[PDB]
């Protein structure tokens, strides 16, 4: 049963925003477990995916993935900023993400 999951779960909190302006260019990711700004230095540079589904059966799979990279730490509590190839849609606020362990540094 537990012979999978070589990634780390996360959540797409929101866009890196001012008070009244959202900058959809870069999102905010909270990795499940990160708890400091020094902690996020490990997760910087990793690859993060947002796995969603749709009715179209492209290449025999309803499942689609939007790629992304952890870019820099955000704040003092351990959230990071991510730059995805396609800006994550505004409807995934709170949805689940996977920060896979590669590219590694150890």
């Amino acid at each position: 049963a537990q012979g999978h999951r070589l990634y780390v779960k996360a959540k797409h909190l929101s866009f890196q925003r001012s008070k009244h302006v959202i900058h959809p260019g870069t999102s905010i990711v909270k990795i499940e477990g990160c708890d400091s700004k020094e902690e996020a230095q490990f997760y910087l540079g990793k690859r993060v995916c947002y796995v969603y589904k749709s009715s179209k059966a492209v290449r025999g799979s309803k499942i689609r993935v939007i790629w992304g990279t952890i870019a820099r730490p955000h704040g003092n509590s351990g959230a990071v900023r991510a730059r995805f190839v396609h800006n994550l849609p505004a409807k995934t606020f709170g949805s689940s993400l996977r920060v896979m362990l590669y590219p590694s540094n150890i």
């Binding site: 012979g3 999951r5 902690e39 490990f42 150890i106």
Partner: protein, 110 residues
């Protein structure tokens, strides 16, 4: 993915890697140094085994021919006595790695 293996030799950025084929069924392969999780398990004898017969042209695309099976078997022959000597290594190589829940990758080391 998730298959603990042993590195055979360094081939510029990529790594010529394989596990004991009798143990994990991992053929000799190239893996980028960014897709490897190096562990702190005790070192394995690799100096004695032959590694010079591995070049990027050898792995490059031109049904696997027999001698490719043979030299891997030869490499296993030079690697099996070591893993037999050190306890728990043989089954550890066979074991597959996964992240049990409630585990922090940064904290727990390798």
């Amino acid at each position: 993915r998730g298959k603990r293996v042993v590195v055979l030799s360094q081939l510029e950025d990529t790594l010529v890697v394989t596990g004991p084929y009798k143990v994990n069924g991992v053929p000799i392969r190239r893996v980028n140094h960014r897709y490897v999780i190096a562990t702190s398990a005790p070192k394995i004898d690799v100096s004695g085994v032959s590694v010079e017969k591995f070049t990027k042209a050898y792995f490059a695309k031109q049904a696997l021919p027999a001698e490719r099976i043979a030299d891997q078997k030869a490499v296993d022959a030079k690697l099996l006595p070591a893993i037999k000597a050190i306890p728990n290594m043989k089954e550890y190589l066979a074991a597959s790695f996964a992240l049990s829940n409630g585990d922090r990758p940064h904290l727990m080391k390798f």
